[PDB]
């Protein structure tokens, strides 16, 4: 149907907007602390601590399969990156501190992307 094609164009356009959001968020992580999944070789107990791991590569895979239906879903995954790190790592670590910074600096990027998704429908 033509209705299905239009829904598809909307998903594609959301995907394009989210790809740019994701590059912008990831520049707020120059150290590449959240670039890839936590290694289970190197942190074998990780899953006893954190039930839903997230990272930017896993988000990028989901994105390119147009697996985000809206901004809220995308925000949930971003927030898992931060919230996971702040539980697993203590306050006085480079890892926790990099989450706080990614959070604060990501907040601005997301505040405008919410306006762009409402605005552009
Ligand atoms: Na903790």
Curated annotation (Swiss-Prot):
Tissue specificity note: Highly expressed in testis.
Cited function: Scaffold subunit of various histone acetyltransferase (HAT) complexes, such as the MOZ/MORF and HBO1 complexes, that acts as a regulator of hematopoiesis. Plays a key role in HBO1 complex by directing KAT7/HBO1 specificity towards histone H3 'Lys-14' acetylation (H3K14ac), thereby promoting erythroid differentiation.
Protein name: Bromodomain-containing protein 1
Segments forming a coiled coil: none
All residue ranges annotated as the Bromo domain in the record: 9-113
Species this protein is from: Homo sapiens
Oligomer status and interactors: Component of some HBO1 complex composed of KAT7/HBO1, MEAF6, ING4 and BRD1/BRPF2. Component of the MOZ/MORF complex composed at least of ING5, KAT6A, KAT6B, MEAF6 and one of BRPF1, BRD1/BRPF2 and BRPF3. Interacts (via PHD-type zinc finger domain) with unmodified histone H3. Interacts (via PWWP domain) with dimethylated and trimethylated 'Lys-79' on histone H3.
Subcellular location per the Swiss-Prot or TrEMBL entry: Nucleus; Chromosome
Cross-link (Glycyl lysine isopeptide (Lys-Gly) (interchain with G-Cter in SUMO2)): 41
Residue ranges of the TM segments: none
């Amino acid at each position: 149907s033509m209705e299905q094609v239009a829904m598809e164009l909307r998903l594609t356009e959301l995907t394009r907007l989210l790809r740019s959001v994701l590059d912008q968020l990831q520049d707020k992580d120059p150290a590449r602390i959240f670039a890839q999944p936590v290694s289970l070789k190197e942190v074998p107990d990780y899953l006893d601590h954190i039930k839903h791991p997230m990272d930017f590569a896993t988000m990028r895979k989901r994105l390119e399969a147009q697996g985000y239906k809206n901004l809220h879903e995308f925000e949930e995954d971003f927030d898992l990156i931060i919230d996971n790190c702040m539980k697993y790592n203590a306050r006085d670590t480079v890892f926790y501190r990099a989450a706080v910074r990614l959070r604060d600096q990501g907040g601005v990027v997301l505040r405008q992307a919410r306006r762009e998704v409402d605005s552009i429908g």
